[PDB]
Short mmCIF file of C-alpha atoms and ligand atoms in Angstrom, two decimals:
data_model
loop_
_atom_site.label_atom_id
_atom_site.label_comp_id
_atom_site.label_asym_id
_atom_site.label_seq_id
_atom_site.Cartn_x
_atom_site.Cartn_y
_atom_site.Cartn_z
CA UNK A 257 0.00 0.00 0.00
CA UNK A 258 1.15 3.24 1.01
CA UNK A 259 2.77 3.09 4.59
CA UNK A 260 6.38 4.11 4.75
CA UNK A 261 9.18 3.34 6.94
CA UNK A 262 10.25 5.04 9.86
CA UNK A 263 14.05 5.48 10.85
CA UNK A 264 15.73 1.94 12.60
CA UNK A 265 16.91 4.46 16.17
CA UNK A 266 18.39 1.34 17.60
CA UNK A 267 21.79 1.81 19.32
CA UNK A 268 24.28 -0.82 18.89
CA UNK A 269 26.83 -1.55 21.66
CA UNK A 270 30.11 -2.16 21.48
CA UNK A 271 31.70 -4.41 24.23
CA UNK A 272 35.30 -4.72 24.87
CA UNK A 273 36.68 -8.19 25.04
CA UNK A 274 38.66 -7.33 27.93
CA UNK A 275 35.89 -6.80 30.36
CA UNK A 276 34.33 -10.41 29.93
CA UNK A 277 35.77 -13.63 31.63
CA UNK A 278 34.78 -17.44 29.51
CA UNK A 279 34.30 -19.61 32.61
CA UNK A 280 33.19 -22.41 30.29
CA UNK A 281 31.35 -23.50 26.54
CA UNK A 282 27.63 -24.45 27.34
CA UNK A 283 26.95 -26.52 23.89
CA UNK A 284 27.98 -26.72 20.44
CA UNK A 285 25.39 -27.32 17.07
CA UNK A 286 24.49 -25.72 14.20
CA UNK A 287 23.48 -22.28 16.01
CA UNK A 288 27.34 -22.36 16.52
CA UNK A 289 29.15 -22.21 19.59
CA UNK A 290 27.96 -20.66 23.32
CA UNK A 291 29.85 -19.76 26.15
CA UNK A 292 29.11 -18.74 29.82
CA UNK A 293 30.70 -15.98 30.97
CA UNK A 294 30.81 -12.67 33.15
CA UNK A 295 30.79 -9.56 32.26
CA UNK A 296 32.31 -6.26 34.60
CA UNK A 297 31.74 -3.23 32.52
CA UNK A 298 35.01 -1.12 33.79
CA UNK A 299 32.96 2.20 34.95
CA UNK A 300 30.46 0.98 37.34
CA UNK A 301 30.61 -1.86 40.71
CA UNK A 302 28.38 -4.30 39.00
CA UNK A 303 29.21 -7.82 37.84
CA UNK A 304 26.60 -9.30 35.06
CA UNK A 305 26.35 -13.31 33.89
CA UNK A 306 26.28 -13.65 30.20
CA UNK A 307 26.08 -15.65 27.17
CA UNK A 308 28.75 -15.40 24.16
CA UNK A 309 27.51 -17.10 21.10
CA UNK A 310 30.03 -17.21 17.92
CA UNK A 311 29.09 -18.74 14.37
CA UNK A 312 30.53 -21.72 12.99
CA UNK A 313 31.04 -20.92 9.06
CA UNK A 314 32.91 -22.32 6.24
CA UNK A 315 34.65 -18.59 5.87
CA UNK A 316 34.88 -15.96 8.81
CA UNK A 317 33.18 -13.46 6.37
CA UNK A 318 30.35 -15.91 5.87
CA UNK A 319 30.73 -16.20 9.95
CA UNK A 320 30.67 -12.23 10.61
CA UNK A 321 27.97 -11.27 8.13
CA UNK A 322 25.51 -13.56 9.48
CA UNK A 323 26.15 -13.27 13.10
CA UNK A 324 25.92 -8.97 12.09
CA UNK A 325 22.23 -10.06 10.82
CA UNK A 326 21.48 -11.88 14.05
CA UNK A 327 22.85 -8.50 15.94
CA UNK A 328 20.67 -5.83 13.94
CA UNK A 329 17.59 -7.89 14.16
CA UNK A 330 18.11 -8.38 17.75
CA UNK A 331 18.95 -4.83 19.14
CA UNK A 332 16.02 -3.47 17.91
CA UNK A 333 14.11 -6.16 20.01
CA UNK A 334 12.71 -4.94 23.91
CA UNK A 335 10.64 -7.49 25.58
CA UNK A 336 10.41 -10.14 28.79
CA UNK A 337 10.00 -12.72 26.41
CA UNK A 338 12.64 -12.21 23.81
CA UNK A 339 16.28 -12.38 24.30
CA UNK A 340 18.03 -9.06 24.73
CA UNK A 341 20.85 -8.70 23.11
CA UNK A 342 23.28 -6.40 25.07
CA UNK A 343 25.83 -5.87 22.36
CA UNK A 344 28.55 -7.33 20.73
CA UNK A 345 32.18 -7.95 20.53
CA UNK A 346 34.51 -6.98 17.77
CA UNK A 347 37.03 -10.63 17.92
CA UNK A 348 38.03 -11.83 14.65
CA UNK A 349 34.60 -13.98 14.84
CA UNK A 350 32.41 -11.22 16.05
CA UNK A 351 30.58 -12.63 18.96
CA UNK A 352 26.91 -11.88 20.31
CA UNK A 353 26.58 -11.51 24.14
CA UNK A 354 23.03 -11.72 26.16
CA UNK A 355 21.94 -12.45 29.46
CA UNK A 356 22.27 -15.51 30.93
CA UNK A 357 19.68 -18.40 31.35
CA UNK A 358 20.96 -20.57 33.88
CA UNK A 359 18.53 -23.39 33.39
CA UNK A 360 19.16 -23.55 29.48
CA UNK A 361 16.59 -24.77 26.57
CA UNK A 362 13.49 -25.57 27.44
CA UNK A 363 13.41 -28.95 25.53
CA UNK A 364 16.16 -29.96 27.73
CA UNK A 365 14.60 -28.61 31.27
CA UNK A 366 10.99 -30.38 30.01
CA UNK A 367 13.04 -33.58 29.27
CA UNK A 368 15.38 -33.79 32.74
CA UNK A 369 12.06 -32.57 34.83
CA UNK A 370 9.84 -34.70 32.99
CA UNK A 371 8.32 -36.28 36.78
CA UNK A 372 8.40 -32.65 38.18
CA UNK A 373 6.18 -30.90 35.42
CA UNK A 374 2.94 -30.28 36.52
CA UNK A 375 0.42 -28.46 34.20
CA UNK A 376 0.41 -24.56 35.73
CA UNK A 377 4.40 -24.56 34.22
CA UNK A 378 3.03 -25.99 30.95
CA UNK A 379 0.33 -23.82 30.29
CA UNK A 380 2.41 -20.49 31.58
CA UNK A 381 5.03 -21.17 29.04
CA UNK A 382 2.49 -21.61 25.85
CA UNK A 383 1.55 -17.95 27.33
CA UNK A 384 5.02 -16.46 27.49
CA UNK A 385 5.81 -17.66 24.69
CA UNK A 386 2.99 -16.35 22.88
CA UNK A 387 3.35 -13.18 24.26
CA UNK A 388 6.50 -12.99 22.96
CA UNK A 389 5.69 -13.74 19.44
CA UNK A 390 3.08 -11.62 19.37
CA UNK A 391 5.30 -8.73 19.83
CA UNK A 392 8.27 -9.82 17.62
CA UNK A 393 4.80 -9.59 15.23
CA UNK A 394 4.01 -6.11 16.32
CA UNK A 395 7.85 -5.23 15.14
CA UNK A 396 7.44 -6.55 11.72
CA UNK A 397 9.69 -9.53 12.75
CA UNK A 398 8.95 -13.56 10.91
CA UNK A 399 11.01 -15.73 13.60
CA UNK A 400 11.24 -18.99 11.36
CA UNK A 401 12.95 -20.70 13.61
CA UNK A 402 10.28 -20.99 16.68
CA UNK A 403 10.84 -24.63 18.67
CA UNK A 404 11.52 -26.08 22.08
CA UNK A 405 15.41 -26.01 21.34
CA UNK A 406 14.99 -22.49 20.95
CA UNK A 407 13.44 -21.41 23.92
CA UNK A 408 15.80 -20.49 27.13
CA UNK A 409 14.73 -20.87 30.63
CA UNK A 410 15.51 -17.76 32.78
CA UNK A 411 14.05 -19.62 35.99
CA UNK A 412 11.00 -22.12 36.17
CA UNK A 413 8.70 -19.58 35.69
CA UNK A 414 10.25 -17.42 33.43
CA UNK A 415 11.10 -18.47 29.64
CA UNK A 416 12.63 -16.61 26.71
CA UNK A 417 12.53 -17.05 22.86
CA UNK A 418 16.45 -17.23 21.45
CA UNK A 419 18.21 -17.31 18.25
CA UNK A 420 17.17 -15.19 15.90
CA UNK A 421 20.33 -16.75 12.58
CA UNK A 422 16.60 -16.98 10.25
CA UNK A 423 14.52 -13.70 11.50
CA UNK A 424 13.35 -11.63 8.77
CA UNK A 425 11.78 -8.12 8.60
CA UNK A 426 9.19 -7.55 6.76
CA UNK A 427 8.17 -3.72 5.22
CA UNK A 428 5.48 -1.64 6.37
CA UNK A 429 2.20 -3.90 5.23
CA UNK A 430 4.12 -6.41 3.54
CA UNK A 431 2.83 -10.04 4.07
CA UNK A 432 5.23 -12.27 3.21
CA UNK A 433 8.65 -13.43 2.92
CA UNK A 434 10.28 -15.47 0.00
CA UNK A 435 13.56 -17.33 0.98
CA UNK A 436 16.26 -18.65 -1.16
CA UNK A 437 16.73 -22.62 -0.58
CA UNK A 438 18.62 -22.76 2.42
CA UNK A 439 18.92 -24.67 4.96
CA UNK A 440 15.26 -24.78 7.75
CA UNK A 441 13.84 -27.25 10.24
CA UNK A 442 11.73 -29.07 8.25
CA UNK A 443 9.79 -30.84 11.11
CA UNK A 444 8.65 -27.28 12.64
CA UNK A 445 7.88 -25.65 9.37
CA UNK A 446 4.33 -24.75 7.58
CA UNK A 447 3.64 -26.70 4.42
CA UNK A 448 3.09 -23.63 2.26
CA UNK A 449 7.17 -23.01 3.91
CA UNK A 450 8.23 -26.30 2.77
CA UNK A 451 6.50 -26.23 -0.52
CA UNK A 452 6.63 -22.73 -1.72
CA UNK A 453 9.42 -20.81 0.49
CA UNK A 454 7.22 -18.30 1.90
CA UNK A 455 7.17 -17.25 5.90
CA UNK A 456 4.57 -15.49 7.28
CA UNK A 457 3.87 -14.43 10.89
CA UNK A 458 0.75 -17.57 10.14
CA UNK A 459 3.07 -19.49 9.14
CA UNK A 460 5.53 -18.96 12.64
CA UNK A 461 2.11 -20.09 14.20
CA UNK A 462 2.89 -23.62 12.72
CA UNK A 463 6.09 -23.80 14.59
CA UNK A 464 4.46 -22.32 17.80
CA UNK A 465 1.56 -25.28 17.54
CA UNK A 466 4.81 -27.99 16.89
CA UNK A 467 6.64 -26.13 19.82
CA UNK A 468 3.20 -26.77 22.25
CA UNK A 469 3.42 -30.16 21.18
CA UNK A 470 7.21 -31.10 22.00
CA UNK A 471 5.99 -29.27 25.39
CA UNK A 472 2.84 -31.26 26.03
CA UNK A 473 4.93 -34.86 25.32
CA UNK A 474 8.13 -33.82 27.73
CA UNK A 475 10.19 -32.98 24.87
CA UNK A 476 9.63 -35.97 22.32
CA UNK A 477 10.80 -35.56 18.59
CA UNK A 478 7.99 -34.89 16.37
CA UNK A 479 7.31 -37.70 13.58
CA UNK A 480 10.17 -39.54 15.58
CA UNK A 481 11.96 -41.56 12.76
CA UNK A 482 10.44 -40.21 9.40
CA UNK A 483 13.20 -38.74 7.31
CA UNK A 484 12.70 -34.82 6.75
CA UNK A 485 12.15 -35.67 2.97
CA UNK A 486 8.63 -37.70 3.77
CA UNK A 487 7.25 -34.94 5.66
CA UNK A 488 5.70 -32.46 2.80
CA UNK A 489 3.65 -35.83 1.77
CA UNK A 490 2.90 -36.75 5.44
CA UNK A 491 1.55 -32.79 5.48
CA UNK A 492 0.07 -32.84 1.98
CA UNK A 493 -1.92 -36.39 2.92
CA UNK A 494 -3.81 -34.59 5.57
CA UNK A 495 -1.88 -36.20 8.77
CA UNK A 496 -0.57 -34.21 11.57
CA UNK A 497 1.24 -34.82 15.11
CA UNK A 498 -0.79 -37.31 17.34
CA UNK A 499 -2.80 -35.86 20.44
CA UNK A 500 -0.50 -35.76 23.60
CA UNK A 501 -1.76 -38.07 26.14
CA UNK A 502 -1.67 -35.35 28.69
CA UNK A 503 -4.22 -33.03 26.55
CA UNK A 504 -7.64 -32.57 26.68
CA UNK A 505 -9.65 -31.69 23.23
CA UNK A 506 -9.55 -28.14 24.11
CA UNK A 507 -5.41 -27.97 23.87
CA UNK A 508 -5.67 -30.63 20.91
CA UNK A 509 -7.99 -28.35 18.90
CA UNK A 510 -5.61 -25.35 19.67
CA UNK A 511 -2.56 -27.25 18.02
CA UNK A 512 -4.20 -28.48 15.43
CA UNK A 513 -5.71 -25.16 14.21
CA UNK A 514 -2.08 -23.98 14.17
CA UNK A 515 -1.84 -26.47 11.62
CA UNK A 516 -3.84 -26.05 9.54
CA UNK A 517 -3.56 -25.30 5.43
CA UNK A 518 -5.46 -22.27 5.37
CA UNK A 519 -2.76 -19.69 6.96
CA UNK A 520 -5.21 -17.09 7.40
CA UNK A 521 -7.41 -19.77 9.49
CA UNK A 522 -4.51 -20.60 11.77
CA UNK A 523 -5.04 -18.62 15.10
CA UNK A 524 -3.16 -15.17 16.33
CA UNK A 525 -0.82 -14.63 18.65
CA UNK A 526 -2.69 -12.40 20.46
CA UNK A 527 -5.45 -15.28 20.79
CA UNK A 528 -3.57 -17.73 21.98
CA UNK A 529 -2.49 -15.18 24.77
CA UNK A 530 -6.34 -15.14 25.68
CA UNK A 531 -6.43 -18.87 25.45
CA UNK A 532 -3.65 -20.14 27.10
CA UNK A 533 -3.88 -17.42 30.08
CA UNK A 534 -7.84 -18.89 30.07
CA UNK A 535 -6.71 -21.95 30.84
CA UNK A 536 -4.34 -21.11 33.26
CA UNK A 537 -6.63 -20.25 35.65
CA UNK A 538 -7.81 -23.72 35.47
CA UNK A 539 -4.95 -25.88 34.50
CA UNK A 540 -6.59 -29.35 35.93
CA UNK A 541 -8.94 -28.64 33.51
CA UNK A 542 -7.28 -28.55 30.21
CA UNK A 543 -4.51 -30.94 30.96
CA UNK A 544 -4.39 -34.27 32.97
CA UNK A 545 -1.13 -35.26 34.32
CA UNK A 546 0.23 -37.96 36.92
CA UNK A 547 1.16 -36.31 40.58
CA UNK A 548 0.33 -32.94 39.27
CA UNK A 549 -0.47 -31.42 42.69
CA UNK A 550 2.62 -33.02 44.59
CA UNK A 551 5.57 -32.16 42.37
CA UNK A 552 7.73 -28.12 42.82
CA UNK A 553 10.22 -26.77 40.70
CA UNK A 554 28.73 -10.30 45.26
CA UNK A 555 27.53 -7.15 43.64
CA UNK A 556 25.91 -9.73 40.85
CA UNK A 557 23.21 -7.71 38.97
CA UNK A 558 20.74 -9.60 36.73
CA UNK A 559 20.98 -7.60 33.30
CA UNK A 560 17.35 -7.34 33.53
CA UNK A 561 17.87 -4.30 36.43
CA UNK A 562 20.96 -3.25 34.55
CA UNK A 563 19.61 -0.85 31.90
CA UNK A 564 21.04 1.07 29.18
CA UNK A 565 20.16 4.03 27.89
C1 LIG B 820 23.91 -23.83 24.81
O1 LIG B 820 22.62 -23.43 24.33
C2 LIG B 820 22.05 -24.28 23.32
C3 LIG B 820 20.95 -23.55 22.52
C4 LIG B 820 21.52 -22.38 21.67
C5 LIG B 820 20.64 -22.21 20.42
N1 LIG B 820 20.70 -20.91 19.77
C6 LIG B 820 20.98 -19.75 20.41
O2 LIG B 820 20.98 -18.69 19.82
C7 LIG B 820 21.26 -19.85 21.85
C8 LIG B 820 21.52 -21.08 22.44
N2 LIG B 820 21.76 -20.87 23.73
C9 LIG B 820 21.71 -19.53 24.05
C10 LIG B 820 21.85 -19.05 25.44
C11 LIG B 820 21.49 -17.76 25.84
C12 LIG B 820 21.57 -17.41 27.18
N3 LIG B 820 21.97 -18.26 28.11
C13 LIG B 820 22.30 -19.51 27.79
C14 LIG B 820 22.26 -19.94 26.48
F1 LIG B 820 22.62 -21.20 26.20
C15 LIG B 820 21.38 -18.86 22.89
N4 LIG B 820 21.20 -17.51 22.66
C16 LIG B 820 22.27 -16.58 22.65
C17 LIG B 820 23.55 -16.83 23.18
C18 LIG B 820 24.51 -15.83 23.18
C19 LIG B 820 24.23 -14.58 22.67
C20 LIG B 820 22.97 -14.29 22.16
CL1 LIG B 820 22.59 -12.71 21.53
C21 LIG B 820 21.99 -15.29 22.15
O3 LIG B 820 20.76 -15.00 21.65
C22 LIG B 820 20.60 -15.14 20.24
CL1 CL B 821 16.94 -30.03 14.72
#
C-alpha cells in the first residue's frame, strides 16, 4: 500500500573483550558455539552473567555477516520474552553476548524434569511464549525458527525465545517473505514453507503449535523416525502430530488449528495469549497429568535491572 518506513533508532553496543571472563562452553550445534561468561563493565561496581555465542562458518566473512544479521535484528528487540541482546564484541569472529539463562533450553529442562512438570508450568510457558511472538509480530519480525530447542529458561517460571540466525523483517504492510533454498527445520515448518518458500507471521504459528506439542509430550521428537524428505507428503496427505496423552480436546484443537492449510485460518498470537492465560486459571482442567499437585520446581546484577540508555 502506502505506509512508509520510519528510521531503525536502535543503538548498537560495542563491548570490549577485555571486560568479559569465559568460565566455560555451554553446547555446540548448528546455532554455533555458546559460552558462559561474566561480564564487569570497567565504569560501574556491577558484575553481570552472560552468554557469548560465535558462528561456525565455512569462511569468517560468511561467519561475521551472518552473526551482524542476528545482531541488527536483535537490538532493535525490547521485551520479557525475547532475548536481549546487550551488544557485541569486535574478535576476529564477532561474537553476540546476552543475558544468561541458567537453566538452558526448554526442551532440555521439560526432558530432565519430565516427573516434576505439573500443568500450571506448561500452560504459563504456551503464554510467554505467545506473548512474545506476538510482539516480535508487532515489530514486523517472521522468527522462522520458533521450537523447544529455541526457547531459554531464565528460571521455572520465566522463559525466553532465542536465536534469531533466520529472523526476517518484513516492510510496512508487507505479508510475506520469500527465501532462497537454504537450509530450515523441516519438522517445525508450515507446508506452504516447505512447498513454496514463503514465511509469514501464520506461518511462525505452525512452529508455535509444533513447539506446544514437544511441550505437552516432555520434549519428544515430532514424527520420531520419518526422514525430513517424507514430511511435505505426510503434510500434503492430511496427517498431523498425534494428540499428547496429557491433553484434553480443548489444547488438541488449539494445536491443530495452528496447523492447519489455510494460513489465514490458523489462530493469532494475540489469541492464543487469551487462550492459554484462560486456561491457566484452570490448568486441571485442560490438561491431565500424573502427581500434578505433589511435584515443585557479590555485587551480581541480573541484566534485567541493569539498563542502558
Ligand atoms: C547452549 O545453548 C544451546 C541452545 C543455543 C541455540 N541458539 C541460540 O541462539 C542460543 C543457544 N543458547 C543460548 C543461550 C542464551 C543465554 N543463556 C544460555 C544460552 F545457552 C542462545 N542464545 C544466545 C547466546 C549468546 C548470545 C545471544 Cl545474543 C543469544 O541469543 C541469540
Ligand atoms: Cl533439529
Amino acid at each position: 500500500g502506502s505506509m512508509g518506513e520510519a528510521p531503525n533508532q536502535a543503538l548498537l553496543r560495542i563491548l570490549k573483550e577485555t571486560e568479559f571472563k569465559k568460565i566455560k562452553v555451554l553446547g555446540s550445534g548448528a546455532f554455533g558455539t555458546v559460552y558462559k561468561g561474566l561480564w564487569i563493565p570497567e565504569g560501574e561496581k556491577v558484575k553481570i552473567p552472560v552468554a557469548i555465542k560465535e558462528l561456525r562458518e565455512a569462511t569468517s566473512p560468511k561467519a561475521n555477516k551472518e552473526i551482524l544479521d542476528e545482531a541488527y535484528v536483535m537490538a532493535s528487540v525490547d521485551n520479557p520474552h525475547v532475548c536481549r541482546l546487550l551488544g557485541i564484541c569486535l574478535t576476529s569472529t564477532v561474537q553476540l553476548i546476552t543475558q544468561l539463562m541458567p537453566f538452558g533450553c526448554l526442551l532440555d529442562y521439560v526432558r530432565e524434569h519430565k516427573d516434576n512438570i505439573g500443568s500450571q508450568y506448561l500452560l504459563n510457558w504456551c503464554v510467554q511464549i505467545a506473548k512474545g511472538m506476538n510482539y516480535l509480530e508487532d515489530r514486523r519480525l517472521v522468527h522462522r525458527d520458533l521450537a523447544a530447542r529455541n526457547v531459554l529458561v531464565k528460571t521455572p517460571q520465566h522463559v525466553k525465545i532465542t536465536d534469531f540466525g533466520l529472523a526476517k523483517l518484513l516492510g510496512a504492510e508487507e505479508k510475506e517473505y520469500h527465501a532462497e533454498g537454504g537450509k530450515v527445520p523441516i519438522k517445525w515448518m508450515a507446508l506452504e514453507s516447505i512447498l513454496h518458500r514463503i514465511y509469514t507471521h501464520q506461518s511462525d504459528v505452525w512452529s508455535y503449535g509444533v513447539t506446544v506439542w514437544e511441550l505437552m509430550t516432555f520434549g519428544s521428537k515430532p514424527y520420531d523416525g520419518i526422514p525430513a524428505s517424507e514430511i511435505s507428503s505426510i503434510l500434503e496427505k492430511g496427517e498431523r502430530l498425534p494428540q499428547p496423552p496429557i491433553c484434553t480436546i480443548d489444547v488438541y484443537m488449539i494445536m491443530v488449528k495452528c496447523w492447519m492449510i489455510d494460513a489465514d485460518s490458523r489462530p493469532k498470537f494475540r489469541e492464543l495469549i487469551i487462550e492459554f492465560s484462560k486456561m491457566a486459571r484452570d490448568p486441571q482442567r485442560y490438561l491431565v497429568i500424573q502427581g500434578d499437585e505433589r511435584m515443585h520446581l557479590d555485587d551480581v546484577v541480573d541484566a534485567d535491572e541493569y539498563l542502558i540508555p
